[PDB]
Symmetry: D2
C-alpha cells in the first residue's frame, strides 16, 4: 500500500461528503466542510478532488457567497497541492430537473439546464480541470409514451454540441465525458450503457472532444462485463475518465468501495488499466477516480476508512496483477490458450476476400473435426489468475 500523488487517485466531494440520506431514511452524518475535505484527502495520499457545482456552491448562493466559498476553496487547494482534474454539474437534485435537464419536455427548463452547464464550463476552465463530466441522471422516463424518443436524442445532441462548440470557441483545454447509467433515478435513462454512449458521440458535430466516463456499478446494473465495456471504450480511443466503485448485483446503485463488489472483475479492471492489452495497443493514462459512498451505518472514522480502503484495494489488486502477468507459467498458459494468436491478422498480407474466398487450406479441404479437438485450456488459465489474486502464487 501507501498511495502517493503519482498514483492519480482523485475523489469526488460528494463521495466522502455523502451524509446518508437514501430513499428509506435521513442522513446519518453531519455535513462535511469542503476545506476540511481537501485537507483530509491530501493527507491520505489523493492527487486531486472533483465536485459538482452545487457540491461547493449552493443553488441559491449569491455572487458574494460564491466568491467567499471559492476563496476558501482555492486557498485549501493551494495549502495542500490538490489538483481539480474534473468538474461536473448537478442537473438532478432541484425539483426543476424532475423530467431532465437537456431532454426536459419543458423548453424553458432545457435552456435553464444548458445555461447552468455553460457557466460551469467557465468554472471548470478556471479550476484547471481537463475533463468536464456529464451524468444525465434525469434524462429518461418511467413510461414509454412520455417522450418522443427521436426528439429526446436530438435535444441531447443540441445540449452536448452547444457545450463542446463553446469549449472550442473559448479555447478551454477541456474534453466532455458522458456517464452512462441504465436506470435510477428514472425507470429508463437515455444512453444507458457504454455502447449507447459511444454510438451517440458518433452522431455529434463536435464528437472529437466528447468521450466517456464509464462507472463500474453502472454497467453491472445491466449485468454487463465492465472490463469488456471499458476495453471497447479504450479500443475506440474514447476512455477519457473512469469511475471505480463496487456493486454486488443488479439492484439499486450501491457505490461501495472499489473491490467490495465483484472482486474478480475488479482484478481484471486493474490489469487493463495498469497492464493494458496482452498483444499491445492503447493504454488509459488518466486519473483513477473513486465514485463511491461510505456506508450509512458508519460514522466519520468509517468515512476516512473508506477513502483509504479504495486506494488500498486498487494498490493490492495492482500488485497481484503485475505479478500475474510477469509469471512465466501464466505467459505459457496464455500462449497455449491462443491469447497472442488472436493478435495475428486472419488474412495473410496482401490476401483478398476472393484470394482467401475461403482458400482450402481454409474452406473446402479444411478438417473442421480435427481443428475442434484443440484444448483452449481457458479453465486452467482462469485458475492461474484466481491463485495470483488470492496471493497463493
Amino acid at each position: 500500500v501507501q498511495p502517493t500523488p503519482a498514483d492519480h487517485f482523485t475523489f469526488g466531494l460528494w463521495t466522502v461528503g455523502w451524509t446518508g440520506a437514501d430513499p428509506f431514511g435521513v442522513a446519518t452524518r453531519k455535513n462535511l466542510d469542503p476545506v476540511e475535505a481537501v485537507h483530509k484527502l491530501a493527507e491520505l495520499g489523493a492527487y486531486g478532488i472533483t465536485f459538482h457545482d452545487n457540491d461547493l456552491i449552493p443553488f441559491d448562493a449569491t455572487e458574494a457567497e460564491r466568491e467567499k466559498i471559492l476563496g476558501d476553496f482555492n486557498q485549501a487547494l493551494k495549502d495542500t497541492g490538490l489538483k481539480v482534474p474534473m468538474v461536473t454539474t448537478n442537473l438532478f437534485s432541484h425539483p426543476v430537473f424532475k423530467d431532465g435537464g437537456f431532454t426536459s419536455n419543458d423548453r424553458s427548463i432545457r435552456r435553464f439546464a444548458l445555461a447552468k452547464v455553460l457557466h460551469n464550463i467557465d468554472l471548470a476552465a478556471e479550476m484547471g480541470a481537463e475533463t468536464f463530466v456529464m451524468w444525465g441522471g434525469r434524462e429518461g422516463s418511467e413510461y414509454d409514451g412520455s417522450k418522443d424518443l427521436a426528439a429526446a436524442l436530438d435535444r441531447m445532441r443540441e445540449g452536448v454540441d452547444t457545450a463542446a462548440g463553446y469549449i472550442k470557441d473559448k479555447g478551454y483545454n477541456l474534453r466532455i465525458a458522458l456517464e452512462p447509467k441504465p436506470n435510477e433515478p428514472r425507470g429508463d435513462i437515455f444512453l444507458p450503457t457504454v455502447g449507447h454512449g459511444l454510438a451517440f458521440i458518433e452522431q455529434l458535430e463536435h464528437g472529437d472532444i466528447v468521450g466517456l466516463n464509464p462507472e463500474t456499478g453502472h454497467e453491472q446494473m445491466a449485468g454487463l462485463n465492465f472490463t469488456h465495456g471499458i476495453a471497447q471504450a479504450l479500443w475506440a480511443e474514447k476512455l477519457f475518465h473512469i469511475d471505480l466503485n463496487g456493486q454486488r448485483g443488479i439492484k439499486y446503485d450501491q457505490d461501495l468501495v472499489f473491490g467490495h463488489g465483484d472482486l474478480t472483475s475488479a482484478f481484471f479492471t486493474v490489469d487493463l488499466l495498469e497492464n493494458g492489452f496482452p498483444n499491445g495497443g492503447p493504454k488509459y493514462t488518466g486519473p483513477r477516480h473513486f465514485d463511491y459512498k461510505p456506508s450509512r451505518t458508519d460514522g466519520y472514522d468509517g468515512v476516512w476508512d473508506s477513502a483509504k480502503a479504495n486506494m488500498s484495494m486498487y494498490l493490492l489488486l495492482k500488485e497481484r496483477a503485475l505479478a500475474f502477468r510477469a509469471d512465466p507459467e501464466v505467459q505459457e498458459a496464455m500462449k497455449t490458450s491462443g491469447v497472442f494468436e488472436l493478435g495475428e491478422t486472419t488474412l495473410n498480407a496482401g490476401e483478398s476476400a476472393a484470394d482467401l474466398m475461403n482458400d482450402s487450406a481454409s474452406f473446402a479441404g479444411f478438417d473442421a473435426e480435427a481443428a475442434a479437438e484443440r484444448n483452449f485450456a481457458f479453465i486452467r488459465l482462469n485458475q492461474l489468475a484466481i491463485e495470483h489474486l488470492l496471493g497463493s502464487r
Copy 2:
C-alpha cells in the same frame, strides 16, 4: 387479424423447425421438412422465409446434395411466392466454433469462419436477400483473461469489413445487420447490446453498408428498454432488420411469441414501427421477422398455432396502437405532457452559446421554483395507453 403478404411477416426456418432440444433435454418434435415449412408459411399469410446456411444444407452435404436441396427449395419458393429477404450463417453449432468464428483464438478457425461467410454471401445474393445477418453467438468468453479484448475487436472488424468489401466488390444489393446478445451461449458476448453494436459499426472501413438486427429478448436479457434501444438504432439510420419475440425477464433466451413476454413494451414497440415518432422523423419500413421458438411441451398443432399467434399479436397490437394515437383525448394528453414541446429546438434560430450563455430570461432571472410546479401528467398519459391496449377506450 388476417395477415396478408403486404404486412411483411417473415419467419426463420429454425423457428418452426426448432425440435425442442434445450440444455436439459432431447427434442420433442420430429424434424420439419423445408419444402413443408415453405408451404405451411405461405398458406398462413407470411411474406417470406429466412434461414441459416446449415438450416437448409447440412454442414457435411456434398455438392450433389447441395444442388438437390436448393432445387426442391427453389421450386417451393416458386410454387408459393415466398421471398427470401434475409439469409444468415451458422457460426455456433459445430464444435469447431467453440471459441467463436471471427474472434476464435485459433487463426485457422478464423479463416475457416470467414470462408464460410463469404460463400454464404454468394448464396444470399443468389436468393435475392437484401439483408445478410451476423449473430456472433460464440464470440466472447466465460473468463476475463481468455482474450486480448483489443485484439478480439480488431479480429471482429477484419471479418465484418472483409465481408462488406466483398459485397461492394461483387455489387450484390446486400447490407450486413449485426445481432447483439449480451450472453448465452458464452458467459459474455462481444457487442452485447444495441449501443455496443452501433458504436462498433462506426470504427469500420465499410460501415455504410453495416447496420443492426436488434432482437426484443436480447436487449431484455440486459434489462434494457427495447423501444428506447430501437429508437436509437432508428435515429442513427441503422435499423436494417428486426427480430420480434417475447422474453419474461433476465434469464435464458426464451424466444416466446411476440407479445407473450413484456406486453406493454411490445405495444410501444408496435407503435414505433407502425406510427414512428410523435413529432415526425425516420420510419422503419423493412420486414417484421419473428425470431421465436415454439414451446417444447406442444406438438406440431402448437407449432402452426405459434406462427399464426405471432402475426395475430402484432395485428391486434397494431390496431390498438393506431386507435391510441388517433384518439383526441390522447393527443391532448400528449400536448399537456410536452411530447410535442420536446420537438422544439432549445436554442432560438441564430442564438449562440454566448447569446443564450444562459440568457436570463433563461439563467440569472429564471424562476426555477415556479418552473418546478408543472404537472407533466405522465401517469395520466400512461393510463390512456394501457386503456387503449386493454381495448377499454
Copy 3:
C-alpha cells in the same frame, strides 16, 4: 368501472402522501394533510386507509400534539366512513435504525424498536385494524461479515414472537403479516422473498397468527413470478394481506401503479384473487391494498389520477379475467392442456408406494415414447388469455 367501498381498495397515507424525495433529489410536492388524504380517497371510492405510526404522528411529537393529530384523523374517518384495516411501524427512517430495528447489532436499539412496535400494536387495536404489518427494510447487511446470521434470525424471531405474545395476552383481533423485500435500502435484506417469509413463520412459537404481506414489485426485484409466490402463500393459508403496485424489471423499487409494470402478470394475479384456483382451494378475502408512489414528475392532479388509475386498472383486469374463465373456448383449452387433470391425485385410493412400483402399466410396461406425443397446447391457452386481456374477445 367505478370503485365502491365493496371492492375493498385500501391505500396507505405514505402512498398519495409521497412528497417526491428520492436518493438523487428533493421532494417536488408539498406535504399532504392527513385529513385531506382521508376525504379525497373517500370521494374516489376507497374502502380504507393505512399508515405507518410516523406518517401520522411525528417521531418527536409531544403528547398534546399526538392527541390533536389523532382527534383530527379520527374526525375525518367518522365524517367519511373510512375503515383503517392495517397499521405498520416505521423502523427505517430515523438514523437510530441504520442497522435495523429487530436485528440491529446494538441491543438498546433492538429494545427501543420492540417497545416502539408494542405501543403501535395498542394504537392499531384502538384504530380497528385487523392486520399489523412488519416490513423489516433495515434488517440485513451490505457486507457478508457484518452479521452473525443465525443470531440475526433468533433476534428477528424474538421480536416477532414477543409482538404476537402481547397480541394474544391483550386479546386483540390482530394478525401479523410479514413483508418480504430482497434488497433496498440494505444490500441484502433478511427473509427476502415469500418463500423465506413462509419458512421463518414455521420456526415461531406463535406462528398461527403470523402470515404474509407480499408486494408485487418486491417479488419482481428478484425476478420471481408474483402469481406463483402468492399461490404458495394461499396454499399454506398464510396470505393475510397483499400490496399491489407495478415494477418494470430488476432494479430499484419503483412502486408504480398496479398494472403499470408487468401487465400479463397483473392479469394473472387478478385472475387468482378473483377466480381462485381452477380446481378449487382457498380464496383470498382481504383488502386489495396499493403501496405505490405517484411519479415525482406529477403535481397533485396526478396524485389523485394515480390513486384512481390503481382502482381502474384492477377493475378493468377483473372484468377481463371473469370474461376469460366464463368463455367456453377457454374452458375447453384448459381441459385439453390438463389444467383439470392436475387436480386428480396421482395414486388411486388406498394405493401404496409398493402397489405403484409393482403396477406394470405404470412403470415396467409404460409406453414413455407414446406418452410424450401429447400436444399440451399451452401456447394456444396463453394466446386465448392475452386475447381476452386485450379485449379482442
Copy 4:
C-alpha cells in the same frame, strides 16, 4: 493444498462427464466411461461420486445391460474405495418429462415419474448413499395459465411424501434433499429459492426426513446471497447437502468451478461451512459436492484440471477463512461492530412484553439521537475480510 478423502469432496458423474452440448451446439467431447471417471477422481483426491439413474444406466437399457454396468461400476468403487453418498433421478431429459415428472398435467406421466423415483430409492439404498436429491427442473410453466398452482403443490407433495413414506417403510438410511432453481429449463420453476423449498417441507406429512440441497449458482440466478440462504437452511436444521459451483450474474445456469463466479461470496460460504456462526449454532457436516460443468472449449486435460480447480479453490479459501477468524485484529473489529452483541437476547430473563413497554429507559426516555451516533465500522470489518482473502495479511 492437496485434497484428501477426509475433505469429503464429492463430484457427480454428469459433471466431469458433461460432453459439451448446450442449446446452441453439439458436444465437443467424447462420452466418459464411468469406470474411468471413478478411477480418475480417486487419483485426484475425491471422497466420492454421485449420479443420476440415467447417467449410469441408459433409459432403455435391458436387464442384462443394467447388471453389466452395475458390475463394472461396483468393481471400480471396490478398487478405489470411493463412497456413493448421494443418488438422484433424471426426471427432465426424456420427452415424456416435458411438462414435469411429479407435476406434469398428464396423470399417467406423474405415475411413471413416481415409479421411476421409487425404484431409484432402492438403488440408492443398495449403493450406500445417505442422501436422495430431488431437482424438479421440469416442474413449472412458461405461461401463467398452464397450471392450477394449488394443484401443482398438492401433486408435488403427494410425490415427495410417497417417496419418504416408502423410505420409512423399508427402513432405509436415506434423507431427501430438495434442490431449488428459479428458472431454466422452464420459464418459472416451482419452489424457486431456498426459502420456497423450506416453506414447502413444513406442509409435508413426512417433512422430518425432507431437507434442502441448495446450489450456489441457483440462488445467484435470482440475485440472492447464497451465504444468507444457506444460513436460514442451517438455522432451521435443514441443510442436508450442498452443491458448490460458480455463477457470474443473473443469466443461464453457468455451472462454473466453485470460486470462478462471485469470489467474495465463495469466501463467506466457506467461512460458514468451516467456522460455523460467530456466536455458535449448528454446523454443516455433509459432503462438499461440486455440480459444475468443465467449459466446452476445453478438452479432457481441462476436465481433470477443472475437477482439481474445485478442490484447490475450496482449500485455498478455507486456509484464508481460518486465518481471518484466528486474527486478533479481525476479532476486535467483530466486537466493535456488534457481531457478538447480536447474540445477546433482546429481553432480560423473564422480562415480558408489558415489562419492556413500561421500562422507561428502553422507550420513553431512550435517547434515539445519541444511540444513532454509533460508528458500526462495517466497511473496515469488510476491508479486513478482503485483505485476508487476497492474502495480504
